[PDB]
Amino acid sequence: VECDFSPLLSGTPPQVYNFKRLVFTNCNYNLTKLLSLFSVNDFTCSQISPAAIASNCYSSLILDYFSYPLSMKSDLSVSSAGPISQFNYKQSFSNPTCLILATVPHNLTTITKPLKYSYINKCSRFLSDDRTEVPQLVNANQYSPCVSIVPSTVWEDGDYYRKQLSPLEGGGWLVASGSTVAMTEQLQMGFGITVQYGTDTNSVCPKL
Amino acid sequence: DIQMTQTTSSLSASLGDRVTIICRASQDINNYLNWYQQKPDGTVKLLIYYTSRLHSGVPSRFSGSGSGSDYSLTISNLEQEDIATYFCQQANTLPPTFGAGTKLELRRADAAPTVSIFPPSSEQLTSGGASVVCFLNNFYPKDINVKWKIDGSERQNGVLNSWTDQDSKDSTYSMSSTLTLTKDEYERHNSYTCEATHKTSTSPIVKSFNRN
Amino acid sequence: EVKLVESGGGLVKPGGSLKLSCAASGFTFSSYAMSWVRQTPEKRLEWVATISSGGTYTYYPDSVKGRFTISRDNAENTLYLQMSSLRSEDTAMYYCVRDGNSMDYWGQGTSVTVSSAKTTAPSVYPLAPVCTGSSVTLGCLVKGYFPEPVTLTWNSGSLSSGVHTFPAVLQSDLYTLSSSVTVTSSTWPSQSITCNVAHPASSTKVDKKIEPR
Ligand SMILES: *[C@@H]1O[C@H](CO)[C@@H](O)[C@H](O)[C@H]1NC(C)=O
Numbered sequence: 001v002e003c004d005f006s007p008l009l010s011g012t013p014p015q016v017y018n019f020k021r022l023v024f025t026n027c028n029y030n031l032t033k034l035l036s037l038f039s040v041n042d043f044t045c046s047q048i049s050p051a052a053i054a055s056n057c058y059s060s061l062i063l064d065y066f067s068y069p070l071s072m073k074s075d076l077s078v079s080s081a082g083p084i085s086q087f088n089y090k091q092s093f094s095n096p097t098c099l100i101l102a103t104v105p106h107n108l109t110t111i112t113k114p115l116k117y118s119y120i121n122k123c124s125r126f127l128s129d130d131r132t133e134v135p136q137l138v139n140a141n142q143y144s145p146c147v148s149i150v151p152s153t154v155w156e157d158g159d160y161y162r163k164q165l166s167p168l169e170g171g172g173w174l175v176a177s178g179s180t181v182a183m184t185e186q187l188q189m190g191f192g193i194t195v196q197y198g199t200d201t202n203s204v205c206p207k208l
Numbered sequence: 209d210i211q212m213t214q215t216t217s218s219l220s221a222s223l224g225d226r227v228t229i230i231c232r233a234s235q236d237i238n239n240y241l242n243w244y245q246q247k248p249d250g251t252v253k254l255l256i257y258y259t260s261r262l263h264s265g266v267p268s269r270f271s272g273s274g275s276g277s278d279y280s281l282t283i284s285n286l287e288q289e290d291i292a293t294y295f296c297q298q299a300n301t302l303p304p305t306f307g308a309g310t311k312l313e314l315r316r317a318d319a320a321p322t323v324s325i326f327p328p329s330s331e332q333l334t335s336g337g338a339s340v341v342c343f344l345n346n347f348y349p350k351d352i353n354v355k356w357k358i359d360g361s362e363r364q365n366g367v368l369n370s371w372t373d374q375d376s377k378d379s380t381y382s383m384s385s386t387l388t389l390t391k392d393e394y395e396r397h398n399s400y401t402c403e404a405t406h407k408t409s410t411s412p413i414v415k416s417f418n419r420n
Numbered sequence: 421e422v423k424l425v426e427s428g429g430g431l432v433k434p435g436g437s438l439k440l441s442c443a444a445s446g447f448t449f450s451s452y453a454m455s456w457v458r459q460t461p462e463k464r465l466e467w468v469a470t471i472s473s474g475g476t477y478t479y480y481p482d483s484v485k486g487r488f489t490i491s492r493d494n495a496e497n498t499l500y501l502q503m504s505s506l507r508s509e510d511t512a513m514y515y516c517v518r519d520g521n522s523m524d525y526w527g528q529g530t531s532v533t534v535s536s537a538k539t540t541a542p543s544v545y546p547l548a549p550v551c552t553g554s555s556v557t558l559g560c561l562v563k564g565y566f567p568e569p570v571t572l573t574w575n576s577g578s579l580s581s582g583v584h585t586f587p588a589v590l591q592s593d594l595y596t597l598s599s600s601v602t603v604t605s606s607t608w609p610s611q612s613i614t615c616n617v618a619h620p621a622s623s624t625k626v627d628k629k630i631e632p633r
Contacts, residue, residue, distance in 0.1 A: 156472035257522035306465040324557040329545040370586035384586040417550040
């Protein structure tokens with residue numbers, strides 16, 4: 001009956017392009033319980049307030065977590081032209097969203113570090129003539145089409161990953177380029193929160 | 209480390225059938241699952257990467273589906289060239305780990321073993337050894353029992369057996385059984401018998417010779 | 421056309437060293453991560469090492485860490501695996517592999533055996549039928565060799581149908597292999613059937629003609 005954020009606290013978090021998504025339905029949540037286990041560096045919201053999101057009822061609540069570095073925090077804004085918002089992660093404009101940047105304290109041993117931060121610097125589909133490039137921009141809430149060709153971690157900064165597309169798919173290539181950022185002393189993460197609406201169930205409520 | 213469990217180690221099916229091999233991971237591996245085919249000659253190819261993406265040059269009858277820790281490889285309209293072992297592999301974390309593989313066998317009409325027995329070659333006898341070889345060839349299904357008899361007495365010690373994989377052309381199985389004695393031990397007996405027990409008959413298929 | 425050709429495999433004593441090589445062609449070698457994967461005689465697959473495209477990063481399982489070193493030469497387009505402190509559990513077929521998000525392309529593999537046992541050339545024995553029907557079966561016994569492998573053919577490979585060459589069996593220090601060939605009665609003995617065996621480890625080549633007893 002209580003919304004279970006446990007998968008977040010155990011194991012190695014993913015990267016920004018292959019972010020982990022938790023969908024909560026029919027449960028009670030304690031957002032303060034979760035945020036107190038971390039060192040919150042940034043907390044912003046759109047079409048709602050940090051206090052409101054923690055005290056309302058919705059049809060579902062969506063939480064995205066991933067390894068992200070603070071240095072790169074400007075790139076997470078939707079007013080960036082950078083690779084992150086173009087090819088990795090874009091939040092919903094139409095629905096109320098929250099973006100939390102936090103740091104894993106040394107006490108939180110259960111969350112293990114990745115070797116480094118990885119992201120897609122570009123994602124493109126080349127046509128059958130191997131010349132004409134159609135950039136693949138991320139839609140809000142959606143994964144990059146290149147998550148299927150990029151490893152769960154970029155092996156080395158500047159790597160290119162590519163796969164041929166079958167004639168049924170119109171042929172050509174799917175090509176992506178990866179970048180890395182050196183790992184910080186404590187793991188830095190990003191959390192994305194989205195809430196959805198429905199007329200039947202508003203069974204995602206704050207625990208009282 | 210993440211454990212990959214392929215729940216069936218051997219599968220039997222007919223041509224045109226739809227085969228589904230299932231792979232379980234000990235953890236959520238976030239679709240980073242790949243499939244490989246190894247043919248009997250040892251050649252390994254990539255079939256599917258990232259759960260459902262088809263590698264180029266791989267026929268459309270191969271497909272993939274799954275999420276979390278439950279994944280499947282499917283082969284539709286089963287062909288002859290599909291006799292192979294199929295391995296799954298997680299690529300979510302290091303080390304990448306493989307399943308123990310699933311062997312796929314084709315069904316065919318029941319077939320009796322062709323049994324042949326071979327006395328030691330005079331060249332081996334010259335060197336002081338004596339192997340009695342028996343071939344049990346082109347039978348189906350693969351289940352078979354071989355018994356050696358020396359002058360009516362069953363013999364188990366000194367017998368090396370070997371089995372072939374399913375023949376890619378006629379879907380049968382074959383096996384080799386070799387009883388090794390020294391030349392001296394060999395020359396102390398007369399009758400040497402090789403007996404096959406197989407579904408296709410109630411009484412055993414028998415091949416024998418005498419040292420005369 | 422992607423090609424990966426391994427070499428360097430052989431017999432090595434326990435506690436010994438061995439360096440494998442892989443000649444890559446048909447793609448831009450320096451653009452891909454490369455990996456080594458081994459398969460035990462029991463057909464179990466195990467990842468051994470991965471090296472990043474530029475050679476900057478290397479990764480190993482615990483079973484080989486500190487003993488094995490993967491390396492690459494992007495100018496020469498070749499991948500290397502230096503093995504040391506070898507144990508008998510390292511005995512396997514070693515495959516060179518193109519990596520990325522998946523293992524794209526696999527080489528044909530190179531055999532490695534870790535054993536104290538010594539190289540032994542095989543004895544090859546022709547198996548003629550006992551002193552008749554519409555077909556005849558002939559045999560070949562390849563006995564007492566080490567290590568794997570041997571190559572066996574009939575009439576230099578022109579006779580491939582009706583052949584069953586059985587997996588080699590290890591009994592103590594030595595391997596035994598057998599092969600049968602089944603032809604029509606009018607084919608043998610009127611036509612010549614010869615067994616051909618090669619054991620590279622001992623530099624051995626033997627032809628054995630099947631004669632009637
Ligand atoms: C979390 O919410 C629960 C109500 O379900 C409350 O009892 C508890 O005190 C809260 N935790 C913190 C950190 O205050």
